[PDB]
Design a protein around this nucleic acid. Structure first.
Lengths: 332, 87, 332, 87
DNA sequence: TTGATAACGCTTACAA
DNA sequence: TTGTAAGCGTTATCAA
């Protein structure tokens, strides 16, 4: 049974009211009184009950984070940013996994809003209108991170994926490649279908190259899918000379699946991954990837949320951080 | 006061280090700034610093102008070399 | 004033108690009523406030989680285990990184106790007599996860690191090896200095093989510290024939580093990693490793905490989960 | 009720998959057990199932007795192969 | 500067 | 079945 501000007020012949003022460093408190109750608290080892405070102040200095799978090398990186900038601004966090399950996502949202979070950072592969509905119904700000929202209604922080895949695809053409394949993530998700797959087709038709509906493999972000993807693209009568994966993890599957088939990277084929995760530095040959400031994305987003929670004016709720490419040994 | 560095960092001004540089510029009352490629942003603002996209190679320019614009610029240099983000 | 349990009552023309019973699914509501109120709830857009629930009930259905760094391939996986068992038991989690900074740890502990968590799961690398003292005087139950505590008086769940290394070194010894090295983790943390290392030194003593200082390399969990450990060992006049890494990440550094010096794993060097993470598989050759049910650690730890939060009896506060070596191709 | 399988899953009876199996058995009234070459634990207990360390190439015996002791054994068998665990 | 005293939103005996 | 009312620990509004 923790000690309340009443025990303190007792141990200092003062009223709960002044203890409260002393705990929040209220100016109008005679220095004699402040230090009297101050030391009093310490003598009692008084730790203020944040829930009780949360009821009265209607503010819990805690934001809720909804993420698909924190065990992921990508998301956990984003979680670090969100978490660092959060602590910076004295904000606690409630992290919950959704696994890209709509039911769970909207449920987590209800749950967090229920515990009175002062804000939310949302990450998901498929934001539907049903989401936007619930989002717009949130009493507290909501910021998206590394996610794609066709509706463009919720403030989000990320990078132009379509542009990114484009820059990559073109770069391969500038080096000669004519038959460039694409290994994507579940097409069910907009980020693959509407953003990455597009930036890929665009670079082609804009490079007069013919779209080959067989150079498009639909992996599932898994290392095995990317492993099973190269085994496929190397069967058709016409096989690619360069492959661009939507994520580094799939990339390794591609590198290896090929190495196991005899062909050696980059000699025979040229590979480019996406995200630039430590996975792309722990591979032989070192993987070239489309860079993405994963931590920055998480950190800029949480910083933006803080600006929205403090109710301070903000320009363009939809931010876009810059992206680049880092070629290594996986490309001649 | 101001000093120019050349981003030696392999990842440039990003990730944690970036966050560290910003938290240091905030420990001082002075008005710390950071110009790069013809654009100056507050060095205490995570959004500005990380929006520039400073990569390995480029060179920045840390500003300052206040009752402690000195102890600050110095402190800024400390971190600028602690995580290895230019010099 | 904005849609509270009171407003719902006025609407369904009932008392606050019945609105509270219907909301909690208490089986004592005349169907025609439980319905009348659910209606009101809908029409009013009512959402129960958990904070107020917390204040009243004396618990918040959320636990605390102090992790050194969630962006770690290891700790993150251990986090997904905790989070999944918490959802299982209708519990929320408050995540926060400690970076192993004692100051931060003890502070997070105090914050979370402040936020009135119903329990905490702790993961650290250096539990001092103070940490122990702090834990012992906590209002709510505390449970360590995959951590080492010399004074072993705080419930915890993990594996026997001294035995796991021993088993791994023995295995290699039985394969006829005689000059076995060990690339460890920071000797600061006891897990490395007092467990993994001793497991290593013991296997050698029970084999009558002399201890060779030069065969003990101190990495820092960094894939790169892995590459360097190899270089140093393959730099000695008396090189090792097999190397045991205290971590898979370091092991890949070992494989690739030696792979670059021209050596041919496993033919020229037997390598064995530790953790059996997703990386173990995503390496060529496939990395043989000591399996540690990381996820299970995070899950059995949270499951243990639920028992303790529910003030129920428990057999043994210290729990050791089993381990096993899984040989791949990184070993002859 | 009763049934003996053979863990075919590489990771064995661990992680999420093990969790799912324990939840299923949990929703049925009848008592559910898991016997691994000797020891026997409660399939409705996360600690029990994960303490056996049941790795691939092992044989276990899932038993159920009580009310829904039939639908129980059936649902488990489904989960077993549904989650890609045992045969 | 202080100190009574309502809110805050909901759980829970204790009653009816 | 359903209603009454006393908390739970802090903040916040008014007077002193």
């Amino acid at each position: 049974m923790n000690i309340t501000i009443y025990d303190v007020a007792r141990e200092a012949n003062v009223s709960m009211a002044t203890v409260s003022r002393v705990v929040n460093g209220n100016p109008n408190v005679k220095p004699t009184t402040r230090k009297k109750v101050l030391e009093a608290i310490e003598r009692l080892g008084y730790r203020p009950n944040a829930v009780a405070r949360g009821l009265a102040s209607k503010k819990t200095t805690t934001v809720g984070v909804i993420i698909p799978d924190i065990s992921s090398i990508f998301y956990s990186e984003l979680a670090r940013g969100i978490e660092d900038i959060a602590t910076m601004y004295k904000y606690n966090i409630i992290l919950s996994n959704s696994d890209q399950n709509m039911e769970k996502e909207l449920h987590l949202l209800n749950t967090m809003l229920g515990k009175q979070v002062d804000g939310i950072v949302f990450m998901g592969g498929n934001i539907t209108d049903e989401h936007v509905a619930e989002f717009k119904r949130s009493p507290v700000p909501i910021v998206l991170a590394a996610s794609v929202e066709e509706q463009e209604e919720t403030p989000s922080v990320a990078i132009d994926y379509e542009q990114a895949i484009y820059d990559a695809v073109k770069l391969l053409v500038d080096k000669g490649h004519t038959d460039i394949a694409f290994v994507s993530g579940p097409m069910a998700e907009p980020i693959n279908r509407s953003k990455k797959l597009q930036g890929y087709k665009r670079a082609l038709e804009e490079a007069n190259l013919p779209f080959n509906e067989q150079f498009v493999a639909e992996g599932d972000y898994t290392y095995d899918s990317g492993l099973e993807a190269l085994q496929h693209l190397m069967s058709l009568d016409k096989k690619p000379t360069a492959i661009l994966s939507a994520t580094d993890e799939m990339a390794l599957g591609i590198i290896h699946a090929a190495q196991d088939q005899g062909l050696s990277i980059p000699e025979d084929l040229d590979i480019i991954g996406f995200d630039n995760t430590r996975l792309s530095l722990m591979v032989r040959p070192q993987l070239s990837t489309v860079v993405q400031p994963t931590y920055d994305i998480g950190a800029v987003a949480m910083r933006l949320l803080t600006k929205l929670m403090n109710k301070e004016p903000v320009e363009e709720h939809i931010v876009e951080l810059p992206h680049r490419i880092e070629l290594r040994k996986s490309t001649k | 006061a101001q000093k120019t560095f050349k981003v030696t960092a392999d990842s440039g001004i990003h990730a944690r280090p970036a966050t560290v540089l910003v938290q240091t510029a905030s420990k001082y009352d002075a008005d710390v700034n950071l110009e790069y490629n013809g654009k100056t942003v507050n060095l205490k603002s995570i959004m500005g610093v990380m929006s520039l996209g400073i990569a390995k190679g480029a060179e920045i320019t840390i500003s300052a102008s206040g009752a402690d614009e000195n102890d600050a610029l110095n402190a800024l240099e400390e971190t600028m070399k602690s995580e290895g983000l230019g010099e």
